[PDB]
Protein backbone atom coordinates (compact mmCIF):
# COMPACT_ATOMS: atom_id res chain seq x y z
CA UNK A 1 0.00 0.00 0.00
CA UNK A 2 1.28 3.91 -0.54
CA UNK A 3 1.19 5.71 2.23
CA UNK A 4 1.15 8.85 -0.16
CA UNK A 5 -2.13 7.39 -1.49
CA UNK A 6 -3.69 6.80 1.89
CA UNK A 7 -2.71 10.25 3.54
CA UNK A 8 -4.17 12.14 0.34
CA UNK A 9 -7.77 10.60 1.14
CA UNK A 10 -7.21 12.38 4.29
CA UNK A 11 -7.40 15.48 2.37
CA UNK A 12 -3.46 15.99 3.18
CA UNK A 13 -1.50 17.22 -0.32
CA UNK A 14 1.65 14.22 0.07
CA UNK A 15 3.50 11.90 1.59
CA UNK A 16 7.27 12.52 0.37
CA UNK A 17 10.98 11.63 0.97
CA UNK A 18 14.16 13.01 0.09
CA UNK A 19 16.39 11.71 -2.67
CA UNK A 20 18.36 12.72 -5.71
CA UNK A 21 20.37 11.11 -8.50
CA UNK A 22 22.87 8.99 -6.88
CA UNK A 23 19.69 7.25 -4.77
CA UNK A 24 17.33 7.35 -7.90
CA UNK A 25 20.00 5.66 -10.37
CA UNK A 26 20.20 2.55 -7.13
CA UNK A 27 18.61 0.00 -6.30
CA UNK A 28 14.99 0.45 -5.83
CA UNK A 29 14.82 3.78 -4.72
CA UNK A 30 12.90 4.81 -8.01
CA UNK A 31 10.46 2.07 -7.88
CA UNK A 32 9.36 2.73 -3.88
CA UNK A 33 9.19 6.48 -4.85
CA UNK A 34 6.91 5.89 -7.87
CA UNK A 35 4.75 3.67 -6.14
CA UNK A 36 4.67 5.05 -2.45
CA UNK A 37 5.48 8.70 -2.22
CA UNK A 38 4.66 11.72 -3.79
CA UNK A 39 6.58 14.58 -3.00
CA UNK A 40 10.56 14.74 -3.20
CA UNK A 41 13.34 17.08 -1.81
CA UNK A 42 16.88 17.11 -3.24
CA UNK A 43 19.01 16.05 -0.11
CA UNK A 44 22.00 17.57 -1.29
CA UNK A 45 22.07 18.78 -5.38
CA UNK A 46 20.22 22.11 -4.32
CA UNK A 47 22.26 23.14 -1.38
CA UNK A 48 24.61 25.91 -2.11
CA UNK A 49 27.96 24.28 -1.29
CA UNK A 50 26.25 22.20 -4.91
CA UNK A 51 25.05 24.65 -6.93
CA UNK A 52 27.34 27.95 -6.67
CA UNK A 53 30.52 26.81 -5.28
CA UNK A 54 32.59 29.75 -6.47
CA UNK A 55 31.16 33.05 -7.02
CA UNK A 56 28.60 33.56 -9.92
CA UNK A 57 29.70 29.35 -11.04
CA UNK A 58 26.30 27.56 -10.79
CA UNK A 59 26.05 23.97 -11.61
CA UNK A 60 22.72 22.36 -11.24
CA UNK A 61 23.06 18.80 -13.08
CA UNK A 62 22.31 16.89 -9.94
CA UNK A 63 19.29 19.52 -9.41
CA UNK A 64 18.07 19.08 -13.36
CA UNK A 65 18.19 15.08 -13.08
CA UNK A 66 15.79 15.51 -9.58
CA UNK A 67 13.74 18.09 -10.97
CA UNK A 68 13.53 16.33 -14.19
CA UNK A 69 12.40 12.84 -12.67
CA UNK A 70 9.70 14.48 -10.10
CA UNK A 71 8.40 15.94 -13.54
CA UNK A 72 8.19 13.29 -15.46
CA UNK A 73 7.02 10.78 -12.60
CA UNK A 74 4.25 13.70 -11.34
CA UNK A 75 6.00 14.51 -7.92
CA UNK A 76 5.78 17.75 -6.14
CA UNK A 77 9.25 19.13 -5.51
CA UNK A 78 10.55 21.43 -2.00
CA UNK A 79 13.46 23.62 -3.48
CA UNK A 80 16.09 22.83 -0.47
CA UNK A 81 17.76 24.83 0.43
CA UNK A 82 18.64 28.40 -0.14
CA UNK A 83 20.04 30.84 2.48
CA UNK A 84 21.38 28.19 5.16
CA UNK A 85 24.65 28.53 7.67
CA UNK A 86 25.45 24.93 6.84
CA UNK A 87 27.00 23.42 3.67
CA UNK A 88 27.88 26.77 2.76
CA UNK A 89 31.11 27.51 0.57
CA UNK A 90 34.00 29.51 1.95
CA UNK A 91 33.71 32.34 -0.93
CA UNK A 92 30.37 33.18 1.28
CA UNK A 93 31.07 33.25 4.49
CA UNK A 94 34.39 35.47 4.00
CA UNK A 95 32.65 38.34 2.28
CA UNK A 96 32.70 40.93 4.75
CA UNK A 97 31.11 44.16 2.48
CA UNK A 98 27.81 44.10 2.93
CA UNK A 99 26.47 45.52 -0.16
CA UNK A 100 28.89 42.73 -1.54
CA UNK A 101 26.68 40.37 0.53
CA UNK A 102 23.35 41.34 -0.52
CA UNK A 103 24.70 41.04 -4.21
CA UNK A 104 25.84 37.38 -3.61
CA UNK A 105 22.43 36.39 -1.52
CA UNK A 106 19.80 38.18 -3.86
CA UNK A 107 22.11 36.58 -6.85
CA UNK A 108 22.04 32.95 -5.44
CA UNK A 109 18.01 33.01 -4.47
CA UNK A 110 16.79 34.64 -7.56
CA UNK A 111 19.08 32.31 -9.49
CA UNK A 112 17.85 29.26 -8.42
CA UNK A 113 14.35 30.30 -8.13
CA UNK A 114 14.12 31.36 -11.35
CA UNK A 115 15.86 28.58 -13.21
CA UNK A 116 12.78 26.14 -11.43
CA UNK A 117 10.24 29.27 -11.55
CA UNK A 118 6.80 27.29 -11.74
CA UNK A 119 8.22 23.56 -11.06
CA UNK A 120 8.89 24.04 -6.98
CA UNK A 121 5.81 24.02 -5.17
CA UNK A 122 7.54 24.76 -1.74
CA UNK A 123 11.17 26.75 -0.85
CA UNK A 124 13.30 26.18 2.07
CA UNK A 125 14.18 29.95 1.65
CA UNK A 126 16.20 30.32 4.85
CA UNK A 127 17.19 27.23 7.02
CA UNK A 128 18.19 26.77 10.98
CA UNK A 129 18.16 30.62 11.71
CA UNK A 130 17.50 30.03 14.94
CA UNK A 131 20.08 29.19 18.28
CA UNK A 132 18.76 26.48 20.41
CA UNK A 133 18.23 29.11 23.05
CA UNK A 134 16.07 31.09 20.67
CA UNK A 135 17.82 33.84 19.60
CA UNK A 136 19.04 34.84 16.09
CA UNK A 137 22.41 32.59 14.95
CA UNK A 138 24.88 34.87 14.21
CA UNK A 139 25.86 33.24 11.05
CA UNK A 140 27.62 35.70 7.98
CA UNK A 141 24.35 36.73 6.87
CA UNK A 142 23.53 37.85 10.22
CA UNK A 143 26.78 39.72 10.91
CA UNK A 144 27.72 41.39 7.52
CA UNK A 145 24.08 42.14 5.83
CA UNK A 146 22.11 42.39 9.49
CA UNK A 147 19.28 41.18 10.67
CA UNK A 148 16.89 42.31 7.88
CA UNK A 149 18.38 39.44 6.17
CA UNK A 150 15.47 37.39 6.53
CA UNK A 151 13.77 39.98 5.05
CA UNK A 152 15.48 40.87 2.31
CA UNK A 153 15.62 36.69 1.46
CA UNK A 154 11.97 36.26 1.92
CA UNK A 155 10.36 39.28 -0.64
CA UNK A 156 13.45 38.43 -2.97
CA UNK A 157 12.29 34.63 -3.20
CA UNK A 158 8.61 35.82 -3.84
CA UNK A 159 9.99 38.69 -6.11
CA UNK A 160 11.36 35.04 -7.98
CA UNK A 161 9.19 32.90 -7.96
CA UNK A 162 5.53 34.49 -6.95
CA UNK A 163 4.10 30.70 -7.26
CA UNK A 164 6.33 29.34 -4.62
CA UNK A 165 5.36 28.72 -1.12
CA UNK A 166 8.18 30.57 1.34
CA UNK A 167 9.25 28.36 4.04
CA UNK A 168 11.26 29.06 6.76
CA UNK A 169 12.57 25.76 8.12
CA UNK A 170 13.89 24.47 11.49
CA UNK A 171 15.13 21.27 13.88
CA UNK A 172 14.36 20.86 17.41
CA UNK A 173 10.91 21.93 17.05
CA UNK A 174 9.02 19.06 18.48
CA UNK A 175 8.45 20.23 22.02
CA UNK A 176 5.48 23.19 22.44
CA UNK A 177 7.61 24.47 25.41
CA UNK A 178 11.18 24.38 24.05
CA UNK A 179 12.68 28.09 23.61
CA UNK A 180 13.53 27.51 20.05
CA UNK A 181 9.46 26.63 19.36
CA UNK A 182 8.87 29.80 21.41
CA UNK A 183 10.95 31.72 19.30
CA UNK A 184 9.96 30.18 16.08
CA UNK A 185 6.35 31.21 16.47
CA UNK A 186 6.52 34.37 18.07
CA UNK A 187 9.09 35.53 15.28
CA UNK A 188 7.17 34.32 12.05
CA UNK A 189 4.02 35.77 13.50
CA UNK A 190 5.93 39.25 13.78
CA UNK A 191 7.56 39.17 10.49
CA UNK A 192 4.32 38.35 9.03
CA UNK A 193 2.74 41.20 10.75
CA UNK A 194 5.41 43.36 9.03
CA UNK A 195 4.64 42.45 5.63
CA UNK A 196 7.20 39.69 5.06
CA UNK A 197 6.22 36.80 2.91
CA UNK A 198 6.55 33.37 5.21
CA UNK A 199 3.79 30.88 3.70
CA UNK A 200 5.08 27.65 6.09
CA UNK A 201 6.99 26.84 8.78
CA UNK A 202 9.24 23.64 8.07
CA UNK A 203 9.74 21.04 11.25
CA UNK A 204 12.65 19.28 9.98
CA UNK A 205 10.91 16.42 13.73
CA UNK A 206 14.43 14.84 13.15
CA UNK A 207 13.83 12.69 16.55
CA UNK A 208 15.09 10.33 19.27
CA UNK A 209 13.28 7.63 20.30
CA UNK A 210 10.18 8.45 22.46
CA UNK A 211 10.63 11.82 20.65
CA UNK A 212 6.96 11.48 18.40
CA UNK A 213 4.87 11.58 21.62
CA UNK A 214 5.48 16.01 21.91
CA UNK A 215 5.20 16.56 18.35
CA UNK A 216 1.31 17.02 18.19
CA UNK A 217 1.03 19.81 20.74
CA UNK A 218 3.92 21.03 19.13
CA UNK A 219 2.99 21.11 15.48
CA UNK A 220 -0.12 22.53 16.75
CA UNK A 221 1.82 25.70 18.53
CA UNK A 222 3.81 26.06 15.33
CA UNK A 223 0.17 26.02 13.62
CA UNK A 224 -0.91 29.33 15.67
CA UNK A 225 2.01 31.85 14.31
CA UNK A 226 -0.38 32.39 11.05
CA UNK A 227 1.22 31.26 8.63
CA UNK A 228 -1.38 29.26 5.37
CA UNK A 229 0.67 25.82 6.17
CA UNK A 230 2.84 24.07 8.08
CA UNK A 231 4.80 20.95 6.82
CA UNK A 232 6.92 18.16 8.73
CA UNK A 233 10.48 18.56 6.12
CA UNK A 234 12.97 16.15 7.38
CA UNK A 235 11.13 13.21 9.62
CA UNK A 236 13.45 10.34 10.93
CA UNK A 237 13.33 8.30 14.31
CA UNK A 238 16.25 6.83 16.35
CA UNK A 239 15.66 2.79 16.13
CA UNK A 240 12.95 3.80 13.48
CA UNK A 241 10.12 2.40 15.85
CA UNK A 242 6.61 2.69 14.64
CA UNK A 243 5.35 4.48 17.95
CA UNK A 244 7.08 7.53 17.14
CA UNK A 245 6.30 7.30 13.27
CA UNK A 246 2.64 7.08 13.42
CA UNK A 247 2.61 9.85 16.40
CA UNK A 248 4.03 12.05 14.05
CA UNK A 249 1.56 11.07 11.30
CA UNK A 250 -1.73 11.73 13.68
CA UNK A 251 0.45 15.00 14.69
CA UNK A 252 -0.26 15.64 10.63
CA UNK A 253 -3.49 14.32 10.97
CA UNK A 254 -4.78 16.71 13.44
CA UNK A 255 -3.24 20.29 12.26
CA UNK A 256 -5.74 21.02 9.18
CA UNK A 257 -2.67 23.68 8.00
CA UNK A 258 0.16 20.77 8.06
CA UNK A 259 0.13 19.66 3.88
CA UNK A 260 2.23 16.64 4.72
CA UNK A 261 5.43 14.77 5.42
CA UNK A 262 9.03 14.62 4.19
CA UNK A 263 10.50 11.53 5.32
CA UNK A 264 14.17 12.13 5.28
CA UNK A 265 15.30 9.09 2.75
CA UNK A 266 14.07 5.66 1.59
CA UNK A 267 15.98 2.72 3.26
CA UNK A 268 18.12 2.78 6.31
CA UNK A 269 21.89 2.49 4.89
CA UNK A 270 21.50 5.65 2.81
CA UNK A 271 20.06 7.67 6.45
CA UNK A 272 22.73 10.45 7.37
CA UNK A 273 22.07 8.63 10.47
CA UNK A 274 22.37 4.98 9.37
CA UNK A 275 23.15 3.45 12.21
CA UNK A 276 20.14 4.48 14.17
CA UNK A 277 18.25 2.70 11.18
CA UNK A 278 15.46 5.19 11.28
CA UNK A 279 13.75 5.50 8.48
CA UNK A 280 10.96 3.34 6.74
CA UNK A 281 12.60 1.05 3.75
CA UNK A 282 15.62 -1.39 5.46
CA UNK A 283 19.14 -2.67 3.66
CA UNK A 284 16.94 -4.93 1.67
CA UNK A 285 14.77 -1.97 0.31
CA UNK A 286 12.09 -3.84 2.07
CA UNK A 287 8.66 -2.26 4.01
CA UNK A 288 9.33 -1.95 7.86
CA UNK A 289 7.35 -2.42 10.86
CA UNK A 290 6.83 1.52 10.59
CA UNK A 291 5.58 1.22 7.35
CA UNK A 292 2.93 -0.75 7.62
CA UNK A 293 2.09 0.61 10.90
CA UNK A 294 1.72 4.17 9.08
CA UNK A 295 -1.06 2.25 6.51
CA UNK A 296 -2.85 0.59 9.18
CA UNK A 297 -3.09 4.08 10.90
CA UNK A 298 -4.24 5.58 7.31
CA UNK A 299 -6.85 3.20 6.51
Same mark, same amino acid.
Given at each position: ?? #?????????????????????????????? #??? $????? *????????????????????????? !?????????? !????????????????? &????????????????????????????????????????????????????????????????????????????????????????????????????????????? %?????????????????????? *???????????????? %?????????????? &???????????????? $?????????? !?????????????? #??????
Amino acid at each position: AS #INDLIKTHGKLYFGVATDENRLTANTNAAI #IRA $DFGQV *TPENSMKWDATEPFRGSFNFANADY !LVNWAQQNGK !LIRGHTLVWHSQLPSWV &SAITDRNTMIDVMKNHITTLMTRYKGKIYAWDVVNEIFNEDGSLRQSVFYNVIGEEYISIAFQTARAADPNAKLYINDYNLDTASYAKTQAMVSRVKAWRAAGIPIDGI %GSQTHLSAGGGAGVPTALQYLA *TAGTPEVAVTELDVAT %GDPTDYVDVVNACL &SVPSCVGITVWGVADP $DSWRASTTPL !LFDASYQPKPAYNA #IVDALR
